[PDB]
Design a protein around this nucleic acid. Structure first.
Ligand SMILES: [Ca+2]
Length: 75
DNA sequence: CTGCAGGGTTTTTGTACAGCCAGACAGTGGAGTACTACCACTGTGTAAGACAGGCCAGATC
């Protein structure tokens, strides 16, 4: 199998070269994609002409540091 | 024992010089900021009307 081959043959090379792996996890996008699941439910327009547009808007809004910083609010 | 009344007794309560400043009253000219109903759009539930086919009556096999 593939990943097995990667991990028994190719781990050391990349770990040597590009600093760190798992650092570049795809985990983030897929894992977070459940946000695209929920946003469609709650804040839809709704009409697919807009459904994207407003979903993307809310998403990026939820994504910037700035509002996350203001969400922490002194721990 | 009881009820009632002069005063006690301490607390509470308002009236009392005396000066100070927060807080409000008018309005001005309209911005403007908050509010309230369109509004474009389809997803979801709904229930009137097709309808068919199953059944009884008419009449038959
Ligand atoms: Ca995936």
């Amino acid at each position: 199998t593939n990943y097995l081959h990667k991990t028994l043959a190719h781990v050391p090379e990349i770990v040597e070269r590009d600093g760190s792996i798992g650092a570049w996890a795809s985990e983030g996008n897929e894992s977070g994609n459940k946000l695209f699941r929920r946003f469609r439910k709650m804040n839809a327009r709704q009409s697919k002409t807009f459904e994207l547009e407003d979903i993307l808007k809310h998403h990026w809004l939820y994504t910037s540091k700035y509002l996350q910083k203001f969400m922490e609010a002194h721990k």
